[PDB]
Amino acid sequence: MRVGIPTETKNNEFRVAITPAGVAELTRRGHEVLIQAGAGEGSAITDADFKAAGAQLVGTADQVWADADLLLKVKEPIAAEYGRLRHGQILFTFLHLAASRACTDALLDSGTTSIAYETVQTADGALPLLAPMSEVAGRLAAQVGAYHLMRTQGGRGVLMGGVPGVEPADVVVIGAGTAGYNAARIANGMGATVTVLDINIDKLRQLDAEFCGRIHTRYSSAYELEGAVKRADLVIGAVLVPGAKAPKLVSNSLVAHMKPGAVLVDIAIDQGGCFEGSRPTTYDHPTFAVHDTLFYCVANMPASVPKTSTYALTNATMPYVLELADHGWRAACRSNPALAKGLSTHEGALLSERVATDLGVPFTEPASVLA
Ligand SMILES: CC(C)C(=O)Nc1ncnc2c1ncn2[C@@H]1O[C@H](CO)[C@@H](O)[C@H]1O
Numbered sequence: 605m606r607v608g609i610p611t612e613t614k615n616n617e618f619r620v621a622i623t624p625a626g627v628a629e630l631t632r633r634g635h636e637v638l639i640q641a642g643a644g645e646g647s648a649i650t651d652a653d654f655k656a657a658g659a660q661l662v663g664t665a666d667q668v669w670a671d672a673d674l675l676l677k678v679k680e681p682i683a684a685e686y687g688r689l690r691h692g693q694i695l696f697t698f699l700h701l702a703a704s705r706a707c708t709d710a711l712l713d714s715g716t717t718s719i720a721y722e723t724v725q726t727a728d729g730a731l732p733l734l735a736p737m738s739e740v741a742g743r744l745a746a747q748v749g750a751y752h753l754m755r756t757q758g759g760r761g762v763l764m765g766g767v768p769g770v771e772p773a774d775v776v777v778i779g780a781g782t783a784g785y786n787a788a789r790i791a792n793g794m795g796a797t798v799t800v801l802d803i804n805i806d807k808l809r810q811l812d813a814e815f816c817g818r819i820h821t822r823y824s825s826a827y828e829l830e831g832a833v834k835r836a837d838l839v840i841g842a843v844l845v846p847g848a849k850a851p852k853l854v855s856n857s858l859v860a861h862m863k864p865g866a867v868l869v870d871i872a873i874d875q876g877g878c879f880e881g882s883r884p885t886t887y888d889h890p891t892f893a894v895h896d897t898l899f900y901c902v903a904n905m906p907a908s909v910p911k912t913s914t915y916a917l918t919n920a921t922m923p924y925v926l927e928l929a930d931h932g933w934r935a936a937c938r939s940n941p942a943l944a945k946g947l948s949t950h951e952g953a954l955l956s957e958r959v960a961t962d963l964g965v966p967f968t969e970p971a972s973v974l975a
Pocket residue numbers: 778779780781782801802803804807824825826829842843844845851852853
């Protein structure tokens with residue numbers, strides 16, 4: 605079985621779906637690895653780096669899509685790639701099918717077998733392929749929040765950690781999942797006074813142990829949310845409700861009572877955002893004004909650090925890539941329930957009940973295609 609990796613084609617998507625380490629492991633097990641020339645340059649992975657690991661480098665995207673039985677990507681296929689979808693191909697990437705009926709229809713019409721990184725789910729409820737991206741997005745959230753607090757960036761002009769005798773920035777992280785924990789940790793590492801809110805007290809209990817009380821924890825009632833947001837210099841919205849679209853926790857009305865020049869970073873913006881006035885924005889123009897405060901809602905944040913996030917993503921996908929490459933989609937999903945929960949399409953059948961509800965489309969029970 606051939607494994608193919610094309611260059612990512614979306615705007616500012618610098619990541620790549622495999623590293624030389626993954627190539628060497630695939631090549632070692634007797635698989636051809638086809639990589640489009642330049643696919644890894646955005647992540648500081650040179651064409652020579654891939655070749656030396658055993659990859660057969662290919663000049664165009666067309667040949668990768670055409671010759672690969674298992675096609676690894678980072679983002680969903682865009683319109684220019686629908687014509688490349690094939691019936692005898694397994695596509696393994698971030699899909700976000702509920703957000704695109706056109707992508708969903710393209711996969712279905714193609715008959716291709718697709719598996720979504722973000723719904724791969726282990727028995728304990730975790731999402732091991734989304735998690736490294738949530739980790740990166742959290743840590744980024746603190747450092748872009750820090751930057752935009754500078755007066756030269758429209759912020760209040762407050763240094764994250766203060767200096768001796770001067771007040772640190774007051775940072776509120778909403779949500780203590782993978783992303784919020786990581787945002788809280790870096791914001792606290794920078795010297796800020798960090799308060800993390802959640803409705804799951806056990807998550808608060810972990811934070812209280814891990815930083816010995818230094819990261820403050822508050823139960824996330826509507827009252828407590830309003831109070832802390834009013835006093836904050838930087839608000840990080842980290843409520844990434846799995847599958848569900850993010851609730852609007854910070855209304856534009858509450859934004860108008862915020863400190864002037866306060867900064868809001870929404871790292872749930874790949875799910876519509878957890879602020880009311882959040883709209884997906886880009887890396888060139890990152891911020892916009894909401895009642896004399898600054899909103900940051902850049903989507904696909906981990907792509908801005910592709911050297912980090914390409915490795916974080918593909919370290920996590922590699923064992924599923926090996927199972928797929930060695931056994932094919934059906935046996936691999938039979939053996940591994942976590943991989944099965946990512947099954948999205950196969951031969952015109954939509955296999956995700958959540959997507960199928962959200963779009964109004966025939967839902968095929970995943971058991972029918974596997975057993
Ligand atoms: C007033 C209402 C609007 C409210 O308080 N809402 C919330 N406030 C803080 N945290 C919340 C939350 N709803 C979920 N979460 C947590 O965010 C993490 C996401 O991974 C999860 O751990 C989850 O428990």
